Amino acid sequence: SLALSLTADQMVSALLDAEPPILYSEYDPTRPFSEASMMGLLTNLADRELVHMINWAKRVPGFVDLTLHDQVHLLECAWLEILMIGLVWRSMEHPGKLLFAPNLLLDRNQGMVEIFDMLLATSSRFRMMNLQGEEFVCLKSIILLNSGVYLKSLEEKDHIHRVLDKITDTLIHLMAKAGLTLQQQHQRLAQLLLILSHIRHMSNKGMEHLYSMKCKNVVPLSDLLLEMLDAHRL
Amino acid sequence: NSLALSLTADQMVSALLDAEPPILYSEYDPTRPFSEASMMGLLTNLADRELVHMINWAKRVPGFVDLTLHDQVHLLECAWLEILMIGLVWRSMEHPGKLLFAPNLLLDRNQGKCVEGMVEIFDMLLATSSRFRMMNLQGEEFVCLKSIILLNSGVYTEEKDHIHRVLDKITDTLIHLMAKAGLTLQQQHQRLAQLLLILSHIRHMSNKGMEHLYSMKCKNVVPLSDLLLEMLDAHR
Amino acid sequence: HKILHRLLQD
Amino acid sequence: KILHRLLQDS
Numbered sequence: 001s002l003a004l005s006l007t008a009d010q011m012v013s014a015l016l017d018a019e020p021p022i023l024y025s026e027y028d029p030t031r032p033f034s035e036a037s038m039m040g041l042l043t044n045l046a047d048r049e050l051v052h053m054i055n056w057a058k059r060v061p062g063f064v065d066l067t068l069h070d071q072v073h074l075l076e077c078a079w080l081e082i083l084m085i086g087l088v089w090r091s092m093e094h095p096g097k098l099l100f101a102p103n104l105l106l107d108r109n110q111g112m113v114e115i116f117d118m119l120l121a122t123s124s125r126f127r128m129m130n131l132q133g134e135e136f137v138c139l140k141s142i143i144l145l146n147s148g149v150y151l152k153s154l155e156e157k158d159h160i161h162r163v164l165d166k167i168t169d170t171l172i173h174l175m176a177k178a179g180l181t182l183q184q185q186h187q188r189l190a191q192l193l194l195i196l197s198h199i200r201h202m203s204n205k206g207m208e209h210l211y212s213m214k215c216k217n218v219v220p221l222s223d224l225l226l227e228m229l230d231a232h233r234l
Numbered sequence: 235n236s237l238a239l240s241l242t243a244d245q246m247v248s249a250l251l252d253a254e255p256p257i258l259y260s261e262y263d264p265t266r267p268f269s270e271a272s273m274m275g276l277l278t279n280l281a282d283r284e285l286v287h288m289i290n291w292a293k294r295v296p297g298f299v300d301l302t303l304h305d306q307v308h309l310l311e312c313a314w315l316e317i318l319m320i321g322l323v324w325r326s327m328e329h330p331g332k333l334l335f336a337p338n339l340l341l342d343r344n345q346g347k348c349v350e351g352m353v354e355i356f357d358m359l360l361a362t363s364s365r366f367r368m369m370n371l372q373g374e375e376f377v378c379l380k381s382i383i384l385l386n387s388g389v390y391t392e393e394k395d396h397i398h399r400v401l402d403k404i405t406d407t408l409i410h411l412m413a414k415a416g417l418t419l420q421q422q423h424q425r426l427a428q429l430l431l432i433l434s435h436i437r438h439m440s441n442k443g444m445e446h447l448y449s450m451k452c453k454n455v456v457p458l459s460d461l462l463l464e465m466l467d468a469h470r
Numbered sequence: 471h472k473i474l475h476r477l478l479q480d
Numbered sequence: 481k482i483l484h485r486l487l488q489d490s
C-alpha cells in the first residue's frame with residue numbers, strides 16, 4: 001500500500017489535490033421556489049456532487065486498496081456525512097447561513113429547519129475553532145473510512161485502522177507545526193473528532209428526512225441517490 | 235467558576251468512578267427471550283430502571299451541575315440511549331458474540347433474528363464490544379468516554395464555553411490515564427483518536443436504536459413508561 | 471412539564 | 481448498481 005508509506009506532508013498534499021470542486025446550483029432569484037422546489041435544487045446539487053465524491057474517494061490514500069464491495073459499503077454509509085461536512089466547511093465565513101453553492105446561500109428559512117440549525121451550529125464550531133483546510137481534508141477522509149468500518153477475512157478492517165492511525169499522526173503533525181503545545185494538540189484533536197459525532201447525527205437525521213419526502217412522492221430523487229438512500233433503509 | 239476545572243486528573247477519575255451506576259438485573263424468570271414482546275418487555279423494564287441511575291449519575295459528573303436545569307435536560311434527552319449502549323457494550327466486553335444487558339440476561343444475535351431491524355443493531359453493538367475488547371479498554375477510560383458523550387452529544391443546540399472547557403478537561407484526564415498506563419506520546423494520541431472515533435459509531439447505533447424504539451411504540455406492543463416516552467419523544 | 475425536570479432536582 | 485459501476489470505471 002502506498003498510503004502507509006506516505007509522510008504526513010505528502011498525505012496532506014495528496015488529500016488537498018484530491019479535493020472535489022465547489023459546484024453551482026440551478027437557483028434563480030427571479031424564479032419562485034416552494035418547499036418542494038428548494039429540495040429539488042438540493043437534490044440535484046447533491047446528485048452531481050456524488051459523482052465528484054466517488055472519484056475523490058479513489059484518490060484518498062488506502063481506499064483503492066480495498067475490495068470493490070468494501071468501497072461501496074463505505075461510500076453508502078458516509079455519503080451524506082461527507083456532503084454535510086463539505087457544506088459546513090463552505091459555510092464557515094457566512095455566520096447564520098449555509099453555502100450550499102456560491103449562488104445558493106440559505107439562512108434559517110424553509111420548513112428540516114432543525115437540521116439547518118444543527119448544520120449552522122457545526123459551522124459556528126468550525127469558525128470558533130478556526131478550522132484549517134488541512135484539518136478539514138483529514139476529517140473528511142476519516143469519515144469515509146470510519147463511518148462504515150463496523151465474513152472471513154476481511155483483514156481489510158486492519159488496513160483501514162492503519163490508514164486511520166496515519167491520518168491521526170497527520171493531524172497531530174499539523175497541530176505541532178502550527179505551534180500548539182502537547183496539551184493543546186490533544187485537546188484540539190479531541191475537539192475535531194467529537195465533531196464527527198455530530199456530523200454522524202446530522203446525517204442520520206437527514207437520511208430520515210430524505211426518506212420522508214421520497215415516500216411523499218414530492219421531489220424527484222435521482223437514480224443514484226435512491227440507491228445510496230436505500231442502503232440505509234432498515 | 236466551576237469546581238470541575240479545579241479538579242486534578244486523579245480527582246476527576248475518582249469522581250467519575252464514584253458516580254458509576256450499578257449493573258442492574260433483569261427479571262429472574264429464565265426463558266431466553268425470542269418474541270418481540272418478551273424481548274422488548276425485558277429491555278424496556280431494564281432501561282427504565284437504568285435511566286433513574288443514569289440521571290443521578292449525571293448529577294455527579296463534574297461540570298454537569300453547573301449547567302441550567304434546562305441544559306441538563308437537553309443533554310440527557312439527547313444522549314440517554316448513547317449512554318445506555320456504551321454501558322451495554324462495556325459490560326459485554328469479555329463475553330464475545332454476546333450482549334450482557336444484565337448478568338442474568340445474555341443475548342446473542344440469534345435472538346435478535348426474531349425481531350425486525352434488531353439483528354442489525356445487535357451486530358453493531360457486538361462489533362463495538364469486540365472493538366473495545368481488542369483495544370483493552372480500561373474502566374477509567376470508559377467512564378471518561380461516557381461523560382464525554384453526556385456533555386458533547388447535544389452541545390451544539392455565555393456558558394457554552396463551560397462545557398467546552400470541561401470536555402477539554404476530560405480529554406486531559408484521558409491522556410493522563412494513558413500516560414499513567416505507560417503509553418508513549420505517539421501511542422497516547424493514537425489511542426485517543428481510536429476511542430473517540432468509536433463515539434461516532436455509538437452515536438449511529440443510538441439513532442438507529444431510536445428508530446427501532448419508535449417502531450415498537452407505534453406497534454403498541456410493549457408498554458412504555460412515561461419516562462421512556464418523554465425521552466423518546468424528545469428525539470421526535 | 472417533564473418527568474426529567476423532576477428527577478434532576480431530587 | 482450505479483455506485484459499484486462508477487467506482488469500477490477507469
Ligand SMILES: CC1CCC(=C(c2ccc(O)cc2)c2ccc(O)cc2)CC1
Nearest residue numbers: 042043045046083084087112115116206
Ligand atoms: C436539511 C438537510 C437535508 C440534507 C442535505 C442535503 C441533501 C438534500 C437533498 C438530497 O436529495 C440529498 C442531500 C445536502 C448536503 C450537502 C450538500 O453539499 C448538498 C445537499 C442538507 C440539509
Ligand SMILES: CC1CCC(=C(c2ccc(O)cc2)c2ccc(O)cc2)CC1
Nearest residue numbers: 277278281318319322352355443446462
Ligand atoms: C436494538 C436494541 C438495542 C439496545 C436497546 C435498548 C437498551 C440499551 C442498553 C441497555 O442497558 C438496556 C436497553 C432499549 C430497549 C428498550 C427500551 O425501552 C429502551 C432501550 C434499543 C433496542
